[PDB]
Design an enzyme around this catalytic site. Structure first.
Site, PDB file in Angstrom:
ATOM      1  CG  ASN A  69     108.199  23.805  47.624  1.00 60.46           C
ATOM      2  OD1 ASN A  69     108.867  24.752  47.639  1.00 60.46           O
ATOM      3  ND2 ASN A  69     107.944  23.021  46.642  1.00 60.46           N
ATOM      4  NE  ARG A  87     108.426  19.772  47.997  1.00 62.35           N
ATOM      5  CZ  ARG A  87     108.543  19.481  46.845  1.00 62.35           C
ATOM      6  NH1 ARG A  87     108.466  18.220  46.486  1.00 62.35           N
ATOM      7  NH2 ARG A  87     109.661  19.902  45.952  1.00 62.35           N
ATOM      8  NE  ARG A  99     110.012  16.657  40.895  1.00 62.47           N
ATOM      9  CZ  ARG A  99     109.254  17.642  40.618  1.00 62.47           C
ATOM     10  NH1 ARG A  99     107.900  17.474  40.257  1.00 62.47           N
ATOM     11  NH2 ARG A  99     109.787  18.649  40.382  1.00 62.47           N
ATOM     12  CG  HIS A 158     113.813  21.707  42.463  1.00 63.12           C
ATOM     13  ND1 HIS A 158     112.828  21.642  41.618  1.00 63.12           N
ATOM     14  CD2 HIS A 158     115.122  21.430  41.962  1.00 63.12           C
ATOM     15  CE1 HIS A 158     113.560  21.437  40.371  1.00 63.12           C
ATOM     16  NE2 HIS A 158     114.749  21.347  40.524  1.00 63.12           N
ATOM     17  CB  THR A 174     105.182  20.212  43.641  1.00 67.91           C
ATOM     18  OG1 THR A 174     105.949  19.473  43.121  1.00 67.91           O
ATOM     19  CG2 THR A 174     106.113  21.494  43.683  1.00 67.91           C
ATOM     20  CE  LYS A 218     112.488  24.916  45.991  1.00 73.04           C
ATOM     21  NZ  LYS A 218     110.901  25.339  45.723  1.00 73.04           N
TER      22      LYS A 218
END
Ligand code: MYA
Ligand code: MYA
Ligand code: MYA
Ligand code: MG
Ligand code: MG
Ligand code: MG
Ligand code: MG
Ligand code: MG
Ligand code: MG
Ligand code: MG
Lengths: 152, 135, 152, 142, 141, 152
Positions: free
Chosen positions: B98, B88, B71, B101, B77, B12
């Site tokens: 964060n 993260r 993940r 994705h 998340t 991001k």
């Protein structure tokens, strides 16, 4: 604001002696927390007794105080959202035996009497320790260039 | 075959802005996954002002259970719950920033890949270490 | 403006195959340059003959083109002050044998036919390589949050 | 003894701001030098350098001041920083790896032994210089 | 073939003691050289160098290794940096990690002939392992 | 004393082939454990059958032995408080699918047949495996300069 919470982190004499100051500071910088204060010193025994006063009735306290005085420490204040709890997560379990790989303690040490780092366990303990180790002239205020990218 | 599973990973604008693209790609490479596609773009508006606020790195990665394992490697998340050692967990603080994705399921992954990439941008090659990563 | 200079960097198939994409991008990010464009592709032999047109008469040119087509490359455009010259310094000497420890090639490869990376040798060559590999809509403009701390 | 030489190293506000404090300290620790002193303060390069050219510095911001000890630490420290002008710094140096422009060259190190003693006098109180022995000293020095 | 040159690299007790074994091995691996042999032993630098002033180390642990690749003797020497750390450049092992020549943490052969002599002296032939790297065709043309 | 516990760690052929020897040794060194023994060898099939004898009749035993012989391994003995259990934590779960980020397997591999590393599962297995792979002359003794900062 919650983003102004502060915690006290101290790299213990074994952290200095084994050359881990930079690694630790890097972990806090890269998480996104802001360094507020930092100094390098040999803490006196009376100072360490005031810092660990809650444990004076514990069997290891005499050893603890002796070792925290056996070399210099790096005392620091860091700022950020939930920095107290999150810093504790980053340090790993107080007993390195229980700390997980990826944490400071999990990666770098073995025995609870040589666990290289301390972080405040609560906001109240944080404020007491910050006041004990630092004076207001020693706290540095600035805005991180990446603030708007760390916080919504 | 299960080893050819694919996932979509997007860095991001906060990840690009804080200089984390190399670290993220490195964690995926060293895990043993194969980069299938990658491009750098501005996120057009099809919240959502914030993802137009900057550039994103879109990527497609291939490997066994890459969606779920990806993940895991990203961490939870909400960074407040992320473990040290995850992307993260190591690099961010607040869920609204964060930095990354990843697809939450295989079907989501194939949808995102169709939406962000043309089929010809997906590169087919063999990793020279494939026989040492897979039996 | 001198700070808007751009260069073309390409990670060659051996750089991709040996898992160095992240390391290389990280070095450019941490130097302070801004990623302007990036894509991942198997370049056609036609495309590669156009890219290396100046060397079409060299004995190694057919092999060079074949090896550059034998796997995917990562094409990138980076921006910053003296990014062409400085990017070349960061890559190391084109012949890895003469590259110094600390440079990409000096740290990561051995032989000139497997030198893992290419960077534009001049501003001229940089802009013609950028036009060859990227469409203007693929070039992304944004301001780095650290711009004021990288540039005066 | 020559092993007791000291230098003054200051990480400037662009170094703090771009998150480089740990990397810099790590390079000095792993080289084998001994951290003698360190503090975090606000200081302006402009005001420190205002009496200069006789006939574009950073404003007041956070800096890490440090004193480091070891054999030839002044000169070797300068080598580890790289050229003052990042355009000339080699990869592998602090400035070669991390910055681009001389007005934002993230760090300062003393250029001579006496300059170093002067800067240490200016920036630190004698009691902030901490004396201890590194557990690896006998493996760094013969 | 020139790609089969070998060199001998020994990490000295100061390198072991300061925790540098992994970093050194990592630099040689990532450069693209192939580890041929390695063993961990106790050795006295004095007894070895006074076998054919700076004060050498007494008996301590050393990591002896053999590495293979094109120009690995010379390039290995470049990667170590100058024998006197005072002259070693940042980015080299000695430039990054040490200060004094008597504690320069590592040794590499200075020539192909020296390399073969020291490999015979430190290693048995059966300790030299032959295998092909999976990335060989991406390191060499 | 409990600080002299030893465990056997082996980097498997895939660990060597993907260039991870240095990374792994670094994780053990930085944790505070002491390297006792190390060698680089292609283990014979019969040696491997003895090593994995407890699994002599499982569906995969023949494959395991043949892959462990398909390239060289790095065999090592490491020493420290709880090094057996703590080393197993550092490796991650035997099946990479379950290994957590920050662990060797969690960071670096994917599939159980290519899990790059082995560590003793208990003290008894440690003593047996150390004796199988090393003779006493190959065990090297010295005191870490940092011992007093790693152990109380
Ligand atoms: C509920 C609890 C109390 C578990 C919350 O979790 P909590 O954090 O309260 O667990 P703790 O009370 O053990 O730790 C409190 C402090 O006591 C230190 N300490 C503990 N045990 C020993 C020991 N044998 N030798 C020397 N020092 C020891 C320990 O490092 C920690 O200090 P610091 O590292 O934060 O400075
Ligand atoms: C100096 O300037 P000059 O103009 O005198 O020659 P150059 O050294 O700049 O090389 C220019 C390009 O040619 C490439 N190349 C060169 N030699 C070989 C070779 N034996 N085999 C295969 N490829 C080779 C070389 O990597 C470089 O391309 P890139 O690394 O930028 O992609
Ligand atoms: C605790 C459950 O008890 P369990 O019986 O699961 O013991 P274990 O999971 O520790 O593994 C023992 C050994 O078995 C090996 N191995 C296991 N599965 C496979 C497989 N499909 N294919 C090839 N090899 C396989 C595995 O790597 C491990 O050896 P190492 O990794 O320590 O060298
Ligand atoms: Mg304690
Ligand atoms: Mg997590
Ligand atoms: Mg998401
Ligand atoms: Mg030429
Ligand atoms: Mg913008
Ligand atoms: Mg200056
Ligand atoms: Mg020598």
């Amino acid at each position: 604001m919650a983003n102004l919470e502060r915690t006290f982190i101290a790299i213990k004499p074994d952290g200095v002696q084994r050359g881990l100051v930079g690694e630790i500071i890097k972990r806090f910088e890269q998480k996104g927390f802001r360094l507020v204060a930092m100094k390098f010193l040999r803490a006196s025994e009376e100072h360490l007794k005031q810092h660990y006063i809650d444990l004076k009735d514990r069997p290891f306290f005499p050893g603890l105080v002796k070792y925290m005085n056996s070399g210099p420490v790096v005392a620091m204040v860091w700022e950020g959202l939930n920095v107290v709890k999150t810093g504790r997560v980053m340090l790993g379990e107080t007993n390195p035996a229980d700390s997980k790989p990826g944490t400071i303690r999990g990666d770098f040490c073995i025995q609870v009497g040589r666990n290289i780092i301390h972080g405040s366990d609560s906001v109240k303990s944080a404020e007491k320790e910050i006041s004990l180790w630092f004076k207001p002239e020693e706290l540095v205020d600035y805005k991180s260039c990446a603030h708007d990218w760390v916080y919504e």
